[PDB]
Ligand binder design. Sequence first.
Ligand SMILES: [Mg+2]
Ligand SMILES: [Mg+2]
Ligand SMILES: [Zn+2]
Length: 889
Amino acid sequence: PKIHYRKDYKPSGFIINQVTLNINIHDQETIVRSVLDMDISKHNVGEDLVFDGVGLKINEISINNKKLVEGEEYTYDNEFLTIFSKFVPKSKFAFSSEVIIHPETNYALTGLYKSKNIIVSQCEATGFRRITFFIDRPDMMAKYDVTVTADKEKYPVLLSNGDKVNEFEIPGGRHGARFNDPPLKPCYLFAVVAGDLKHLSATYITKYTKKKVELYVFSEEKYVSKLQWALECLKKSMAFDEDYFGLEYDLSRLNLVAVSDFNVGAMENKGLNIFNANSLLASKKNSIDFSYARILTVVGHEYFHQYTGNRVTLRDWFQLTLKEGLTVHRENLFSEEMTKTVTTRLSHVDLLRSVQFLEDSSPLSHPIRPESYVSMENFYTTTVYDKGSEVMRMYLTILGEEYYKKGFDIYIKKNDGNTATCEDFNYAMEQAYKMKKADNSANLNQYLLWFSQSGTPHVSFKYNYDAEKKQYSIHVNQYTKPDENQKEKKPLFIPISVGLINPENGKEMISQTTLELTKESDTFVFNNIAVKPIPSLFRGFSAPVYIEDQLTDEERILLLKYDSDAFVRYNSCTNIYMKQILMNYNEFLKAKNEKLESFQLTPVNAQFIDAIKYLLEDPHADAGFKSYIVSLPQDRYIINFVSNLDTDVLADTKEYIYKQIGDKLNDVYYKMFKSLEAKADDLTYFNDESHVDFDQMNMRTLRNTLLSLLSKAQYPNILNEIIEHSKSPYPSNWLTSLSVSAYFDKYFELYDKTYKLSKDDELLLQEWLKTVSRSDRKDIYEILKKLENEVLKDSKNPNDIRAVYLPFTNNLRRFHDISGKGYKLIAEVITKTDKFNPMVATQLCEPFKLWNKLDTKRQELMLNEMNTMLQEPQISNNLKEYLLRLTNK
Ligand SMILES: [Mg+2]
Ligand SMILES: [Mg+2]
Ligand SMILES: [Zn+2]
């Protein structure tokens, strides 16, 4: 397998100026005719002309209308088309080809494929080469003129990039549409859609130029009514980019299209955004609450790419984080502003610290700009996206809003063209940094280490207070563990947003302060500090790091109750939980190892439990925040802090801790569950498709969290509440009723009831599948077999496969069953899936990412399954590369 190296970037010896496509869709095949108007670039050294072209069936190829002969003038090996240099012209020339492809049986969902009754493309990163021959790399900028023809009755709606400039009838019940898109673009932003699509539409009038923009949202006829929220989110997204960034949409039309079969959430093709239906379609009746934030987020994200990805392009794929980290950051800013809840930021931090931290301490650890790849598809990671976004967000923390907006505008103005690298963004931000610091000797050269250095920094603290001097010191240390990417780790530029809380009255003692840690260690001193403060460290989670606060649980409880910053409160709670988890874990483990007949456990801190009760009973406190405080930290967060983690021992630890807190607070939980009902479940706006209330949805989250806690505890008569909850109009409620009934003899009754409720909506059935999959059932293996035989079957829909299998892998007790049956089951699914969809097969490997962090026996069981998967004769390049890196081979 070819390994591509970052330091090897060289511009192409060729230029593609113009692409002219004719895509002719027929019943059994699609015919693709392409004329490339080409040139020789200044970097040309007389090399062969090599095009990317994967799985293409050649009918003919030509240079300047002269047919080329196979073997003599060219070879094709189903991956590269090589035209020998002596046959390549020395000035401007036309390359043309006609190939046959088969979207009907393209189950990998890359290139041109059929999703149900829709023909659709997916070209990022390297899928255009699956449609026709090309120098398939993002620095090859070209103009596109695309004609699509198809059966009119089957495919009445035809879409590509640019303006529809002609529509025509074709004999035999066919029709065509031509689309010209004069602005230059990379081929991964080419898109085509053909289907019987229904739409909603609106007009948006831009803020400054007052250009009218046509907004169209598309789906199959059955689900067209589920498009309204997406339309509202698009409007919101356009307004936000205008209001915050001063950026207007430049085209006269934007199309959003939902498809049922999609590898990821969506795709930002210019003017023609294509979406996983689960990230575009929603209704109050047929969607869970989560669909609303998911649509807002994904619609926002793809919209924001129009500048950060599309108008400013990548030079090469190693720069992925420059578009992805920057757009996730813009997306997160958008969502925070639209939702107006502190839980939006908390949820992003919750994702990074569980999922991405796991990745960064695993054998798959890479920097946000990697030095190499084999498979581009394996490159779209939580590190590149979510740590990338935290790195992009630190610019704004360091600069503040005014100067960040200056450096951003500098970046857009200097690179609106035009390809760019991560250094181009850093340069732009550095100019703002020079302006902010008021000296042109200031630089951000050390900041670049955030792009190149893998691993999570550990930031630890020590404190000194001198009562007579009124002088407070914070001593800070940073440390990143060596890994396979760097022997030596260097100190990073770490911004630490801090407050100092007066423990006597809970007040702020100092103004907003961001400590700039640029060394391995530093001491920050504060004068005129009247009383010994409690430090509020890394406000808003100001750097993507392990925080070691070295605070007592009493100090943490006081931050939890009194601090102004949502993250530090949440983190203080998290830290209290972690200390307890680690203590009880070691006590259980010692008992297990020593085969003790009797032993002790350290109870949960009583004042902590008292602080939880205080916050839950505070009517002015946020319901979403409340649901975090009653929940223990994620398993994938916990595992970063324990060597050779025994999953049964951890399951016993969590169980003990939840019972300790429930024994004190269950009456409080029950009272709140009941008192929240009216507002949480309010039906006033149920039939208003555009009325979305994130606070109310957080109240439902809280109620559903509490119901779960009460059902686990077998709170007296709680089954009555569960049964009533199943009668709710909200899917979040009635699907919660299913999962919490797991502990009761009424489970299969609610199984059948909720199935009947879900079965006639494709997306809702997938949510039902997730709920069953995640159900805390002792017969969960028999249940999964039932799902396979009765619901899933041989579906190749990634949403169906992911819904059945992934949530079950979060079942700590059962997925990690000591026989290895859970590991075996997932491995069988990966191998089966890899035959038709390597990308999704790789996604299904996520459970194994923590393999080497578990107890010796479980390490061995997982490793065996991965080596077995590796031994499969037909294994894809994508899966093979991933497992080889994961198993350190
Ligand atoms: Mg083929
Ligand atoms: Mg994407
Ligand atoms: Zn993106």
